[PDB]
């Protein structure tokens, strides 16, 4: 038997492909299905991806945003069915895979360290030219 294969076979019915690739440093908008008392509504959470810990189906990414003077971080399963969509808001470029250090940086400092990833910005604009 191939145990890893079996596990992947169990997870295959739950894997998503509809979501855009992003990298730590990218500013992203996760549209998330939330229940509140009775109904379910879609709440937006937009922030800088500070982390993607990969484990195949079990990959999760962590998005950080300052919200009314308070920094909030929110961890999402990358293949959650609660995730309506993820919009790339902006392409930042980092020099490492985890950006925990931006938790102790000022606004202008984060602006300086994670700059516009011109290359992957142009790749984005060159795509969608698939008319």
């Amino acid at each position: 038997m191939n145990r890893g294969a079996l596990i992947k076979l169990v997870e295959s019915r739950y894997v998503r492909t509809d979501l855009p690739e992003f990298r730590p440093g990218d500013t992203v908008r996760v549209s998330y299905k939330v229940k509140e008392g009775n109904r379910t509504r879609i709440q937006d959470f937009e922030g800088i991806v500070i982390r993607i810990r990969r484990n195949g189906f079990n990959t999760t990414f962590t998005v950080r945003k300052v919200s009314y003077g308070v920094g909030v971080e929110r961890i999402f399963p990358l293949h959650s069915p609660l995730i309506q969509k993820i919009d790339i808001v902006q392409r930042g470029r980092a020099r490492r895979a985890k950006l925990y250090f931006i938790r102790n940086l000022s606004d202008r400092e984060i602006r300086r360290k994670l700059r516009a990833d011109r290359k992957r910005i142009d790749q984005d604009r060159a795509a969608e030219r698939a008319a």
């Binding site: 038997m1 145990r3 079996l6 596990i7 076979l9 997870e11 189906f57 079990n58």
Partner: protein, 204 residues
Amino acid sequence: MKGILGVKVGMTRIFRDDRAVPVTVILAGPCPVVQRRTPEKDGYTAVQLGFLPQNPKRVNRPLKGHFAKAGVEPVRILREIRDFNPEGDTVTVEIFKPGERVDVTGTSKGRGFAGVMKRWNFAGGPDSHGAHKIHRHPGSIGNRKTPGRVYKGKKMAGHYGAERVTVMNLEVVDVIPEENLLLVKGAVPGPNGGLVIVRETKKA
């Protein structure tokens, strides 16, 4: 009572009604009936299941005879499921349906010689304030001249794990019969690749 032999494949989680559900996958079947214990012949009721086919070049003549009386290919494991008389000649994952509760029996992970802190969750000792070479020690093990001895069953360092453990009342989250797979919610004793036993729960 209904049972089946299995292999612990690994863990992961699925989503069910917008809930992430931790699961342990088990490769249960298929388990051919090799022997049936009956009140007349053996004094009790049980079914000896086989599991995992074996290299016939690795099965001695006593065991080959045991399989020949059954008409079964040589197999790696024989385990009885007590008080279980399956209808046919083969026991498969289909004996369980999603939503049933099961007890799973595995062989725990072996800690080897285990400290009193790991084995019994003792508090150990202080790490400063004068503590003298007793940070992970058990402390006193008794009284004085009365009784002048240590009780049997006293909690002490020693081997820990690699032991039969039965976790009970696990939700069967899914059955995938084409792959002989079983999904139980929660944790199951032992390593991946370890052999397990899945019986119908005794809770109610």
